[PDB]
């Protein structure tokens, strides 16, 4: 059905997910234990750390383009990606290189997430009709390596250790770069222009110097969040400021302000919600024990599900204001299955959290998919960095907003932990409700711009 | 996934046991482990526990004579028994739930020991 370049994109992107969600399961449990951080720093670091691997996108896609070609691009930054999978395994060995090896995991995303997204639609003639199935599987293939690594990581780090899933995040690198390799010559004629001259190393060397430069940068910032704050607090008043200066370009402004909300609520997954389940919902479902740290495996499954039959089913401005009602509804959940449907010792069914990863699933289909590709329809590159910028400060707010569900390690009890839980749940919900309900009023004037 | 319960045995009013748990292929040490003891004729209950981070939970009949500790080198959890009365005679269990709760009742547990007998002779 697709060309043969598709697949080798398909099982590479497929790799690559499954080695950073197979940290990202994993991330606030292994703060906690491992290295003794209260709830509340892993939640920050945490944020911090996902902040810095979606602000540096915009570098991996300059890096592509315009310096060393998408191909070769896509290889360095496996190869960085790989390096710090293995590093982060090291640092069971050497604590004192975690945030080096969490940096220079989020300088390898940085510098290879934009491309292959890049190389597949030039795999299709321009007009291709084959375009948009081939971009809702490309999807389903981030969901596919998301949903094993969600599913496998907190099994395999409970059975055998960190130390093993961060090498096996390193072998899935690995293993990207090895299909990869062995199908170049089916993307011979494909790439960006410097693809095709020979490699400047002129150019190479300023990337790697560049390179190691962020990854010393990116630890700074993750062991010192409270001016990773302050650096995102003055980048975004300054840029703010910067771009009131200079009509579908106030439609992005409003719609990434929307966004904000929306990536503060998906950032609970990997922290709040995952501490929840962990907490105060039962271990079991169906009759099988399972860890609850793979309950965020929910996520991509819902996705995965949900992208086929959305693929065959106002336009923009709806959709985004459906999301942020999904989004909405994703924690009203949460908080009416704490304060009515919990057992006398304080847990709840996970039905309810099949429900609410539903929900919030269908929130990102909604927003997600919809809002990269059609803000470029508004539209570029200062109102890209802007984009990049503002879901990486989105990310800072979400680990901030995850520390208000944040529990003393002495706590045992359930029914000490539901009613925290439930009173953040419900106010998020409340919140995320009325965001949707201006959005939804802004609807109509937001669709005379689009005009 | 499965623990083994050792140390129970036959003991006089005041005397003291130690139980000990141990898992096989998981770490225990992300586990919260509850002791319970289901006397003849009585639902089981919970008597004590320690959670993956070193809280504390304690049924009220024993505080200040039992005590639940942790050897994370060992892979092991323990509950020794001190001012041991004829009442504490029991099939004792050690049950495992991931993270740092410690739920009374037997069903927020889901991995369980095959109980070992403590007797407590006047």
């Known amino acids: 059905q697709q060309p043969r370049p598709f697949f080798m994109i398909f099982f590479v992107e497929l790799w690559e997910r499954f080695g950073y969600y197979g940290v990202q399961g994993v991330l606030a449990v292994f703060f906690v234990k491992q290295l003794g951080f209260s709830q509340e720093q892993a939640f920050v670091t945490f944020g911090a750390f996902a902040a810095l691997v979606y602000g540096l996108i915009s570098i991996g896609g300059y890096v592509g383009d315009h310096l060393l070609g998408t191909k070769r691009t896509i290889v360095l930054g496996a190869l960085v990606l790989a390096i710090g999978y293995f590093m982060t395994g090291m640092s069971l060995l050497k604590p004192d290189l975690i945030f080096i090896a969490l940096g220079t995991i989020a300088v390898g995303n940085g510098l290879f997430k934009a491309n292959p997204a890049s190389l597949l639609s030039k795999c299709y003639p321009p007009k291709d009709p084959r375009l948009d199935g081939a971009f809702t599987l490309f999807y389903m293939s981030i969901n596919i390596g998301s949903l094993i690594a969600l599913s496998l990581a907190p099994v395999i780090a409970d059975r055998f250790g960190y130390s093993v899933t961060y090498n096996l995040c390193g072998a899935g690198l690995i293993i990207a770069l090895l299909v990869y390799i062995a199908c170049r010559g089916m993307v011979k004629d494909i790439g960006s222009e410097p693809d095709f001259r020979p490699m400047s190393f002129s150019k190479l060397l300023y990337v790697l110097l560049g390179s190691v430069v962020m990854i010393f940068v990116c630890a700074w910032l993750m062991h010192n969040v409270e001016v990773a704050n302050l650096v995102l607090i003055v980048l975004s008043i300054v840029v703010t400021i910067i771009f009131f200066r200079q009509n579908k370009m106030f439609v992005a402004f409003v719609l990434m302000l929307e966004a904000v909300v929306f990536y503060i609520l998906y950032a609970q997954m990997p922290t709040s919600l995952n501490f929840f389940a962990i907490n105060n919902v039962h271990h079991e479902i169906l009759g099988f024990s399972i860890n609850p740290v793979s309950f965020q495996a929910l996520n991509p499954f819902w996705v995965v599900l949900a992208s086929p039959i959305l693929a065959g089913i106002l336009s923009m401005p709806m959709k985004f204001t459906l999301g942020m009602f999904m989004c909405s509804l994703g924690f009203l959940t949460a908080a009416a299955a704490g304060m009515w449907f919990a057992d006398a010792q304080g847990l709840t069914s996970p039905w309810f959290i099949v429900l609410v990863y539903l929900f919030q699933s269908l929130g990102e289909l909604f927003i997600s998919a919809l809002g990269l590709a059609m803000i470029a329809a508004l539209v570029m590159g200062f109102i890209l960095g802007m984009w990049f910028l503002t879901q990486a400060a989105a990310f800072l707010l979400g680990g901030y907003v995850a520390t208000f569900t944040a529990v003393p390690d002495n706590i045992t009890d359930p029914l000490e932990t539901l009613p925290v839980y439930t009173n953040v749940f419900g106010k998020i919900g409340l919140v995320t409700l009325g965001v949707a309900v201006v959005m939804l009023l802004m609807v109509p004037w937001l669709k005379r711009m689009i005009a | 996934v499965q623990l083994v319960e050792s140390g129970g045995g036959l003991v006089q009013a005041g005397g003291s046991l130690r139980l000990s748990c141990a898992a096989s292929g998981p770490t225990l040490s992300n586990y919260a482990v509850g002791w319970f003891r289901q006397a003849p004729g009585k639902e089981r209950e919970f008597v004590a526990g320690?959670?993956?981070?070193?809280?504390?939970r304690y049924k009220d009949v024993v505080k200040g004579r039992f005590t639940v500790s942790r050897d994370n080198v060992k892979d092991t959890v323990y509950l020794q028994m001190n001012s041991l009365k004829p009442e504490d005679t029991a099939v004792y269990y050690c049950?495992?739930?991931?993270?740092?709760?410690?739920?009374?009742?037997?069903?927020?547990?889901?991995?369980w020991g095959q109980g070992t007998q403590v007797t407590v002779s006047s």
């Open positions: 320690i959670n993956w981070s070193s809280g504390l």
């Open positions: 049950a495992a739930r991931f993270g740092g709760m410690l739920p009374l009742q037997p069903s927020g547990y889901a991995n």
